[PDB]
Amino acid sequence: TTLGASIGSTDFHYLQKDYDEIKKLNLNTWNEVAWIGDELNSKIVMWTNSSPVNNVTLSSSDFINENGDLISSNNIKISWLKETLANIGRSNPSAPLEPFPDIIHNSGSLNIEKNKIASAWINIKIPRNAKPGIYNGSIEVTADELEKSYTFDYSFEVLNLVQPLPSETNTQIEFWQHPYTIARYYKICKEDLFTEKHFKYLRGNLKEYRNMGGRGVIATIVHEAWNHQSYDSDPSMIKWRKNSYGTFEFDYSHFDKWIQLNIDLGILDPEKGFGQIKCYSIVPWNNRIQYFNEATNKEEAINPTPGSDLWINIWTQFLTSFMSHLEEKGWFNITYISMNQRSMDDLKACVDLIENITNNSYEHFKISSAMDYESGNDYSFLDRIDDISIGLSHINHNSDDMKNMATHRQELGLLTTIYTCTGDYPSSFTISDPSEGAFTIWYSLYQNTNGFLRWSWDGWVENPLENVSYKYWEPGDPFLIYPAEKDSIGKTFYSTPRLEKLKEGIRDINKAKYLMEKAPNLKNSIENLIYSLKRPNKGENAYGSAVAASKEDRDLTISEANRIKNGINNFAREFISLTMETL
Ligand SMILES: CC(=O)N[C@H]1[C@H](O[C@@H]2[C@@H](O)[C@H](O)O[C@H](CO)[C@@H]2O)O[C@H](CO)[C@H](O)[C@@H]1O
């Protein structure tokens, strides 16, 4: 009995603390539904008893449907979930470290020590030319110490509908990227910033971003705009100078290469008007603008207050110059000046100034901002902000205030998202149930917004692979992907279960909206399934980290994710049946 094995949920983590409970498992069967061009995930949870085990390997057979059509084993990637330490933990250095299996790591062998849980992630890519049908296959588990092999009956049904490509949808996704963090971690030099040596470590993860739905691209326009909240500094992609004449000149060099990269990777297409450049921020931390004074040869700073005449003068110089620069590049139409949570005075000042400054064609900068909207009715001010993200904790569990607001914005063609961050449940922390990710995306469509935003693509601590612990926030909050190992030749990042569940959700809401468009007489019933979504309640654990109110609320998150997904594929079956019975 030297090695145990079973199928596990992807909805939650299999930890060491639940070893005893886990050792009693024996799910040998797995069945699920998917579309053509979709993906599915599963997990095989394994354990040892009082002996270590070596070269444990997982094998997938080809998958074959009822008509002999073949999805080869190359479309199934089985990857070890690597464990990493996490204080649990919000702003609390004494709370305990625990391993969490947050990292979708590598294929191939793995040694496991005595008395230890070890899980492998199974990702199944259904090719975009796959035939519909019910496919069948086997996943296998040997080791050295096993003179035998375990077997698992896997089947999935491919429905005769094609998963939309991100560009065929109207889902809006924005995850904030931190290219200088990538530079620090891979030891890229100042002089090699935003050259091909740097791009080699950005390109993989930014393609990952695009292929899941990524549309928004953040770019810093002043120095240290979030006051060094993150482990890494946030340098400005636009360097400010004050010349001998005492007016401000700007060096756009980094911004341009950053944006042009994203254009080259297909995330942004300024000519066709796709994607957003989010410029953070006209209201940076404490209004502090750092600059190199050429006159006094000193690094100096100023803190002009929004509305003040110095403030007006200064941002007028910046915005007028930035506009002209963007118009020369042909990027202006997709550029958004980002604001932040401030007083209505500060915000009214920002919007007044932005709407005043116009090009030769009487058009002004688009505006983006996270906000705190909750109570109904008044849209006179928000109708002036082009893209808004509302935090989860500032959304009412019951009222139609948000849905009406969002719908008003939808009627005018303005963007609206929701976001999660520290102190939210559901959220996308290391300690989260990954399913929370899928819920989150359903909630975005529950509220009739355009989708999801999060601040946390890649804000890595020192060595996230071994320890994710940071002095602020629930652990893993600042990053949805892990870096690869510093010496890596090949991979440049690792994905995570929580990210994979955000992807699932995005794929599934895209299904919903595809059905609504294509089968308009199934629409109202789809909307009813969506609008029947039930929101769980927020608790807090012993150390400041937001968690489910109770286990009833935990299981409700999982429950509802599955519920809406399955219901949505039943609508898919209805539209397919309807089609082939009318043919
Ligand atoms: C958009 C975003 O994620 N912003 C930061 C985020 O800030 C939010 C506030 O905007 C919101 O109103 O209140 C929250 C309370 O915890 C939170 O402060 O916080 C992130 C940290 O998880 C991060 O600092 C973002 O910069």
XYZ file of C-alpha atoms and ligand atoms in Angstrom:
609
model
C 0.000 0.000 0.000
C 2.967 2.296 -0.770
C 1.006 4.895 -2.844
C -2.639 6.051 -2.877
C -4.482 7.851 -5.663
C -7.856 9.404 -6.544
C -9.604 12.106 -8.547
C -10.061 15.474 -6.817
C -11.984 18.660 -7.392
C -10.223 21.614 -8.918
C -12.655 23.828 -6.943
C -10.394 23.676 -3.850
C -6.891 22.788 -2.618
C -5.744 19.461 -1.169
C -3.550 20.398 1.778
C -1.357 18.439 4.203
C -3.583 19.281 7.209
C -6.423 17.258 5.635
C -4.162 14.202 4.993
C -6.227 11.759 7.133
C -9.503 12.903 5.557
C -7.890 12.691 2.068
C -6.484 9.149 2.499
C -10.140 7.832 2.439
C -10.776 8.761 -1.250
C -11.581 6.578 -4.279
C -13.166 8.492 -7.192
C -12.058 6.509 -10.288
C -14.589 8.124 -12.685
C -14.779 11.599 -14.237
C -17.253 13.014 -16.679
C -17.850 16.607 -17.863
C -19.163 18.589 -20.902
C -17.270 21.011 -23.155
C -17.543 22.906 -26.423
C -15.333 22.677 -29.509
C -12.259 24.820 -28.752
C -12.906 24.759 -24.980
C -10.835 23.415 -22.083
C -11.543 21.262 -19.081
C -9.554 20.705 -15.896
C -9.323 17.926 -13.400
C -6.886 16.803 -10.757
C -5.506 13.533 -9.491
C -4.796 13.713 -5.744
C -2.128 11.266 -4.503
C -0.699 10.308 -1.115
C 1.956 8.166 0.565
C 1.818 6.386 3.955
C 4.926 5.504 6.044
C 7.350 5.183 3.079
C 8.657 7.665 0.496
C 7.866 7.013 -3.204
C 9.908 7.803 -6.318
C 9.309 8.694 -9.996
C 5.560 8.881 -9.772
C 4.367 9.491 -13.347
C 0.950 10.281 -14.860
C 0.046 9.083 -18.397
C -2.852 10.055 -20.643
C -4.106 7.927 -23.490
C -5.405 9.392 -26.715
C -9.118 10.258 -26.451
C -11.493 8.595 -28.937
C -15.224 9.295 -29.514
C -18.051 6.904 -30.579
C -17.266 7.501 -34.305
C -13.488 6.873 -33.952
C -12.528 10.579 -34.021
C -9.326 11.251 -32.148
C -8.155 13.965 -29.755
C -4.513 12.923 -29.166
C -2.707 12.679 -25.809
C -0.736 15.872 -26.742
C -3.887 17.925 -25.909
C -3.858 16.688 -22.299
C -1.146 18.231 -20.078
C -0.786 16.671 -16.642
C 1.251 18.965 -14.382
C 2.393 18.602 -10.740
C 0.931 21.188 -8.378
C 3.940 22.677 -6.563
C 3.540 23.818 -2.948
C 4.645 27.199 -1.604
C 4.529 28.874 1.853
C 1.949 31.506 2.827
C 1.362 33.522 5.997
C -2.484 33.481 6.234
C -2.160 36.400 7.182
C -3.355 39.935 6.358
C -0.786 42.420 7.739
C 0.035 39.954 10.519
C 3.664 38.706 10.740
C 2.961 36.191 13.552
C 0.161 34.206 11.796
C 1.340 30.784 10.596
C 3.060 29.744 7.375
C 1.332 26.822 5.612
C 2.080 25.167 2.253
C -0.575 25.899 -0.382
C -0.567 24.092 -3.800
C -0.974 27.352 -5.774
C 1.435 26.505 -8.650
C 0.640 24.508 -11.844
C 4.257 23.325 -12.227
C 5.902 20.763 -14.615
C 5.221 17.452 -16.320
C 7.293 14.298 -15.761
C 8.477 12.479 -12.612
C 8.206 13.574 -8.971
C 9.471 12.055 -5.709
C 7.157 12.223 -2.686
C 8.289 11.819 0.927
C 6.490 9.813 3.631
C 2.994 10.799 4.895
C 2.520 13.514 2.198
C -0.302 14.651 -0.097
C 0.647 15.504 -3.707
C -1.787 16.516 -6.462
C -1.452 16.807 -10.245
C -3.458 19.163 -12.453
C -4.960 17.836 -15.697
C -5.767 20.315 -18.444
C -7.623 19.086 -21.545
C -7.587 21.346 -24.571
C -10.381 20.500 -26.979
C -8.977 21.504 -30.358
C -10.882 24.071 -32.444
C -11.325 21.453 -35.226
C -12.507 18.704 -32.876
C -15.592 16.721 -33.832
C -18.546 16.619 -31.447
C -19.209 13.417 -29.498
C -18.555 11.634 -26.219
C -14.812 10.932 -25.964
C -13.246 8.296 -23.702
C -9.735 7.729 -22.397
C -7.639 6.630 -19.448
C -5.189 8.402 -17.160
C -2.548 6.141 -15.533
C -0.319 6.273 -12.413
C 2.778 4.103 -11.812
C 5.845 4.524 -9.605
C 9.169 2.744 -8.859
C 7.888 1.228 -5.600
C 4.624 0.169 -7.295
C 4.958 -3.113 -9.181
C 1.597 -1.932 -10.702
C -0.394 0.972 -12.240
C -3.672 2.751 -11.277
C -6.293 3.593 -13.962
C -9.000 6.276 -14.187
C -12.044 6.328 -16.496
C -12.165 9.778 -18.111
C -14.828 10.799 -20.557
C -15.962 14.188 -21.830
C -18.664 15.235 -24.255
C -17.811 17.760 -26.955
C -20.960 19.700 -27.924
C -21.337 20.843 -31.567
C -20.679 24.529 -30.859
C -17.420 26.436 -31.043
C -16.020 28.283 -28.015
C -15.793 31.908 -29.113
C -12.391 33.418 -29.621
C -11.876 36.298 -27.151
C -12.144 38.827 -30.041
C -15.628 37.507 -30.991
C -16.903 38.367 -27.471
C -17.688 41.579 -25.620
C -16.123 40.451 -22.375
C -13.807 43.097 -20.879
C -10.824 41.879 -18.876
C -8.070 44.010 -17.278
C -5.244 42.626 -15.190
C -2.486 45.068 -14.195
C 0.964 44.118 -15.420
C 4.268 45.133 -13.837
C 7.010 44.772 -16.457
C 9.765 46.206 -14.180
C 8.981 43.454 -11.654
C 9.619 40.945 -14.465
C 12.910 42.787 -15.077
C 13.992 42.676 -11.404
C 13.180 38.976 -11.015
C 15.008 37.890 -14.191
C 17.900 40.355 -13.484
C 17.371 42.496 -16.581
C 19.611 45.592 -16.578
C 18.439 49.237 -16.866
C 20.002 49.499 -20.329
C 18.166 46.327 -21.493
C 14.706 47.486 -20.290
C 12.096 47.126 -23.020
C 14.512 45.516 -25.491
C 14.280 41.957 -26.800
C 16.196 40.645 -23.724
C 13.374 41.980 -21.559
C 10.616 40.949 -24.053
C 11.787 37.316 -23.851
C 10.420 37.239 -20.273
C 7.247 39.239 -20.982
C 5.968 37.606 -24.162
C 4.775 34.207 -22.845
C 2.709 35.653 -19.985
C 1.276 38.490 -22.064
C 0.138 35.981 -24.730
C -1.440 33.996 -21.866
C -3.210 37.218 -20.864
C -4.446 37.894 -24.398
C -5.673 34.343 -25.069
C -7.826 34.349 -21.902
C -9.495 37.683 -22.846
C -6.970 40.373 -21.818
C -7.916 43.793 -23.153
C -6.679 46.488 -20.736
C -3.026 47.499 -20.525
C -1.796 49.607 -17.620
C 1.043 52.117 -17.980
C 2.470 54.352 -15.273
C 2.738 58.049 -16.145
C 4.300 59.278 -12.862
C 6.878 57.911 -10.478
C 5.985 55.440 -7.705
C 2.261 56.112 -8.183
C 1.090 53.532 -5.589
C 3.726 54.698 -3.032
C 5.680 51.480 -3.266
C 2.698 49.405 -1.977
C 4.129 46.387 -3.894
C 7.334 44.455 -3.181
C 8.812 46.043 -6.299
C 8.935 49.782 -6.942
C 6.608 51.044 -9.697
C 8.829 53.184 -11.971
C 7.215 55.706 -14.319
C 7.131 54.747 -17.988
C 7.177 58.509 -18.646
C 10.149 60.360 -17.104
C 9.415 64.012 -16.138
C 11.975 66.835 -16.380
C 11.726 70.529 -15.490
C 13.965 72.539 -17.833
C 15.908 75.788 -17.285
C 12.825 77.746 -18.534
C 10.747 76.070 -15.774
C 8.249 74.094 -17.862
C 7.927 70.301 -17.927
C 9.341 68.054 -20.669
C 8.543 64.339 -20.816
C 10.453 61.258 -21.964
C 7.999 58.671 -23.355
C 10.654 56.162 -24.314
C 9.579 53.293 -21.989
C 5.842 53.871 -22.430
C 6.217 53.623 -26.239
C 8.133 50.348 -26.196
C 5.730 48.918 -23.624
C 2.672 49.875 -25.644
C 4.222 48.915 -28.994
C 5.056 45.489 -27.518
C 1.417 44.996 -26.536
C 0.385 46.153 -30.003
C 2.803 43.670 -31.565
C 1.377 40.866 -29.360
C -2.189 41.709 -30.467
C -3.585 42.881 -27.108
C -4.008 46.433 -28.347
C -4.981 47.440 -31.884
C -5.179 51.249 -31.897
C -6.104 51.467 -35.623
C -9.243 49.306 -35.190
C -9.978 50.712 -31.699
C -9.479 47.493 -29.719
C -8.107 47.359 -26.171
C -7.329 50.057 -23.626
C -4.248 51.893 -22.504
C -4.924 52.764 -18.832
C -2.599 55.585 -17.762
C -2.069 55.533 -13.958
C -2.715 58.198 -12.714
C -3.765 61.836 -12.820
C -4.419 61.308 -9.067
C -1.363 59.324 -7.914
C -0.561 58.799 -4.209
C -0.745 62.122 -2.290
C -0.660 63.861 -5.700
C 3.160 63.425 -5.630
C 4.966 63.988 -8.946
C 8.748 63.296 -8.826
C 10.992 64.931 -11.495
C 14.615 65.745 -12.404
C 15.130 69.528 -12.268
C 17.603 70.535 -14.984
C 17.828 74.077 -13.537
C 18.942 73.086 -9.982
C 20.233 69.617 -11.034
C 18.122 68.059 -8.231
C 15.563 65.236 -8.140
C 12.567 67.198 -6.802
C 8.872 66.600 -6.074
C 5.597 68.499 -5.860
C 2.179 67.669 -4.377
C -0.327 69.962 -6.064
C -3.925 69.643 -4.827
C -6.654 68.819 -7.436
C -8.466 72.015 -8.418
C -5.495 74.264 -7.450
C -3.964 76.494 -10.113
C -0.522 74.922 -9.882
C -2.221 71.527 -10.299
C -4.190 72.798 -13.328
C -1.096 74.350 -14.871
C 0.968 71.202 -14.427
C -1.456 68.542 -15.678
C -2.424 70.823 -18.601
C 1.247 70.751 -19.647
C 1.315 66.947 -19.315
C -2.040 66.090 -20.914
C -1.543 68.506 -23.836
C 1.923 67.081 -24.527
C 0.739 63.468 -23.982
C -2.183 64.001 -26.382
C 0.108 65.334 -29.075
C 2.533 62.433 -28.575
C -0.272 59.846 -28.770
C -1.735 61.482 -31.876
C 1.696 61.262 -33.629
C 1.756 57.523 -32.804
C -1.954 57.124 -33.711
C -2.759 55.687 -30.265
C -4.942 58.451 -28.827
C -8.389 56.876 -29.413
C -7.683 53.861 -27.113
C -5.992 55.825 -24.256
C -7.611 56.313 -20.848
C -6.458 58.594 -18.046
C -6.916 56.570 -14.872
C -8.151 58.164 -11.667
C -8.612 56.495 -8.266
C -10.875 56.554 -5.151
C -10.856 60.256 -4.151
C -13.163 63.014 -2.900
C -15.884 64.240 -5.277
C -13.931 67.569 -5.371
C -10.725 65.878 -6.549
C -12.641 63.801 -9.134
C -14.751 66.743 -10.386
C -11.407 68.597 -10.855
C -9.856 65.726 -12.885
C -12.890 65.376 -15.190
C -13.256 69.166 -15.708
C -9.633 69.431 -16.834
C -9.715 66.332 -19.059
C -12.921 67.463 -20.836
C -11.406 70.953 -21.390
C -8.285 69.800 -23.209
C -9.193 68.775 -26.777
C -7.457 67.915 -30.073
C -8.092 69.682 -33.429
C -11.289 67.490 -33.788
C -12.845 68.639 -30.429
C -12.252 65.245 -28.751
C -10.751 64.690 -25.283
C -9.088 61.818 -23.363
C -11.216 58.870 -22.281
C -11.346 58.436 -18.480
C -11.069 55.272 -16.418
C -11.368 54.782 -12.658
C -12.043 52.337 -9.902
C -15.060 53.734 -7.947
C -17.341 53.015 -4.936
C -20.873 53.176 -6.477
C -23.648 51.626 -4.322
C -26.893 53.769 -4.223
C -29.125 54.405 -7.235
C -30.411 57.045 -9.595
C -27.717 59.709 -10.239
C -25.633 59.009 -13.395
C -24.849 62.618 -14.485
C -21.223 62.387 -13.281
C -20.489 58.705 -14.115
C -21.784 59.171 -17.702
C -18.580 61.323 -18.071
C -16.196 58.491 -16.959
C -15.652 56.074 -19.881
C -14.642 52.932 -17.922
C -15.358 52.156 -14.284
C -14.585 49.186 -12.107
C -16.623 48.736 -8.938
C -15.209 46.801 -5.986
C -17.080 43.622 -4.911
C -17.522 44.752 -1.263
C -19.267 47.993 -2.446
C -21.967 46.028 -4.328
C -25.349 45.470 -2.725
C -26.288 41.783 -2.318
C -29.986 42.396 -3.191
C -30.865 45.713 -4.935
C -31.133 46.420 -8.681
C -29.071 49.661 -8.222
C -25.875 48.263 -9.832
C -27.615 46.291 -12.631
C -29.536 49.451 -13.617
C -26.369 51.550 -13.456
C -24.421 48.998 -15.513
C -27.342 48.756 -18.001
C -27.447 52.539 -18.398
C -23.706 52.396 -19.212
C -24.289 49.481 -21.630
C -27.023 51.547 -23.372
C -24.480 54.412 -23.922
C -21.638 52.028 -24.920
C -19.537 52.665 -21.791
C -17.449 50.040 -20.017
C -18.124 48.730 -16.540
C -16.443 45.946 -14.577
C -16.148 44.719 -11.049
C -12.949 43.840 -9.220
C -11.708 41.944 -6.223
C -8.801 42.854 -4.015
C -7.751 42.518 -0.345
C -10.625 41.907 2.119
C -13.081 40.530 -0.484
C -14.893 37.182 -0.520
C -15.109 35.700 -3.062
C -11.556 36.560 -4.254
C -8.451 35.147 -6.023
C -5.876 34.750 -3.229
C -3.605 31.757 -2.697
C -5.821 30.761 0.248
C -8.977 31.089 -1.865
C -10.972 28.203 -3.189
C -10.043 28.495 -6.887
C -13.833 28.166 -7.747
C -14.237 31.651 -6.288
C -12.607 32.775 -9.547
C -15.388 31.223 -11.613
C -18.045 32.715 -9.336
C -16.507 36.160 -9.685
C -16.894 36.079 -13.488
C -20.554 34.933 -13.187
C -21.169 37.782 -10.768
C -19.891 40.301 -13.368
C -22.618 39.158 -15.778
C -25.142 38.815 -12.907
C -24.712 42.597 -12.538
C -24.876 43.199 -16.286
C -21.348 44.734 -16.373
C -18.856 44.148 -19.175
C -16.647 41.862 -17.067
C -13.705 41.762 -14.619
C -10.629 43.756 -13.527
C -7.904 42.905 -11.064
C -4.710 44.681 -10.036
C -2.640 41.532 -9.826
C -1.241 39.895 -12.942
C 2.365 39.609 -11.833
C 3.378 41.673 -8.738
C 5.807 39.093 -7.446
C 7.485 39.095 -4.002
C 11.159 37.975 -3.795
C 10.727 34.262 -4.468
C 7.004 33.506 -4.882
C 7.773 29.893 -5.730
C 8.993 29.178 -2.151
C 7.202 31.854 -0.162
C 4.449 34.246 -1.299
C 4.193 36.078 2.050
C 3.943 39.873 1.914
C 3.458 42.548 4.639
C 0.154 43.709 3.158
C -2.929 41.721 2.107
C -4.101 38.109 1.963
C -1.212 36.025 0.522
C -0.961 35.791 -3.315
C -3.163 38.876 -3.726
C -0.618 40.732 -5.862
C -0.165 37.981 -8.519
C -2.278 35.535 -10.505
C 0.793 33.915 -12.139
C 4.075 32.666 -10.741
C 7.424 33.353 -12.317
C 9.509 30.494 -13.624
C 12.747 29.587 -11.882
C 15.491 32.254 -12.225
C 17.699 29.817 -14.204
C 14.856 28.701 -16.517
C 15.661 28.028 -20.171
C 12.208 27.650 -21.743
C 9.268 28.566 -19.502
C 8.943 32.136 -18.212
C 5.887 31.698 -15.910
C 3.629 29.136 -14.208
C -0.153 29.341 -14.060
C -2.324 28.796 -10.983
C -5.622 27.030 -10.220
C -7.250 30.371 -9.270
C -6.242 31.835 -12.602
C -7.474 28.716 -14.394
C -10.891 29.165 -12.720
C -11.108 32.803 -13.835
C -10.422 31.471 -17.343
C -13.138 28.794 -16.996
C -15.612 31.485 -15.913
C -14.684 33.747 -18.799
C -15.137 30.851 -21.235
C -18.500 29.928 -19.653
C -19.969 33.484 -19.589
C -18.849 33.767 -23.221
C -20.964 30.641 -23.892
C -23.931 32.259 -22.181
C -23.670 35.397 -24.289
C -23.080 33.459 -27.493
C -26.346 31.546 -26.880
C -28.304 34.719 -26.083
C -27.159 36.324 -29.358
C -27.632 33.277 -31.601
C -30.796 31.850 -29.979
C -32.748 35.022 -29.086
C -35.797 32.983 -28.026
C -33.669 31.220 -25.372
C -32.473 34.597 -24.055
C -34.913 35.467 -21.249
C -34.528 31.973 -19.717
C -30.702 32.317 -19.850
C -31.001 35.720 -18.151
C -33.234 33.995 -15.531
C -30.608 31.318 -14.836
C -27.936 34.062 -14.575
C -30.070 36.481 -12.544
C -30.950 33.554 -10.235
C -27.325 33.600 -8.978
C -27.080 33.492 -5.200
C -24.314 35.490 -3.489
C -22.503 34.027 -0.424
C -21.573 36.027 2.675
C -18.175 37.304 3.772
C -16.433 36.136 6.948
C -12.955 36.692 8.318
C -10.453 34.175 9.723
C -8.346 34.655 12.886
C -5.554 36.700 11.243
C -7.355 39.393 9.175
C -7.910 37.398 5.939
C -11.328 37.487 4.280
C -12.897 33.982 3.976
C -16.411 32.443 3.628
C -18.877 33.396 6.406
C -19.460 29.656 7.076
C -19.043 26.288 5.296
C -22.619 26.746 3.926
C -21.354 29.934 2.202
C -18.173 28.153 1.010
C -20.134 25.289 -0.561
C -22.620 27.783 -2.047
C -19.739 29.281 -4.095
C -18.837 25.876 -5.577
C -22.515 24.886 -5.820
C -23.492 27.978 -7.875
C -20.444 27.845 -10.201
C -21.343 24.339 -11.378
C -25.068 25.166 -11.323
C -24.862 28.041 -13.807
C -22.291 26.253 -15.981
C -24.360 23.073 -16.313
C -27.564 25.011 -16.901
C -25.758 26.947 -19.645
C -24.684 23.756 -21.412
C -28.246 22.471 -21.125
C -29.279 25.628 -23.028
C -26.491 24.704 -25.494
C -28.019 21.221 -25.936
C -31.397 22.891 -26.469
C -30.080 25.209 -29.212
C -28.225 22.291 -30.892
C -31.266 19.990 -30.712
C -33.545 22.769 -32.006
C -31.130 23.339 -34.931
C -30.833 19.680 -36.045
C -34.614 19.047 -35.599
C -35.499 22.101 -37.774
C -32.918 21.065 -40.418
C -8.330 48.492 -8.326
C -7.524 47.987 -7.174
O -7.385 46.784 -6.989
N -6.978 48.944 -6.389
C -6.158 48.698 -5.207
C -7.033 48.036 -4.133
O -7.727 49.136 -3.500
C -9.025 48.830 -2.971
C -9.868 50.095 -2.984
O -9.897 50.657 -4.299
C -11.259 49.728 -2.444
O -12.154 50.845 -2.502
O -11.113 49.313 -1.078
C -10.331 48.126 -0.910
C -10.287 47.807 0.583
O -9.364 46.745 0.865
C -8.942 48.288 -1.542
O -8.163 49.180 -0.750
O -6.280 47.293 -3.191
C -5.356 46.364 -3.757
C -4.794 45.436 -2.693
O -5.466 44.169 -2.702
C -4.251 47.167 -4.417
O -3.602 47.993 -3.447
C -4.834 47.996 -5.552
O -3.857 48.988 -5.873
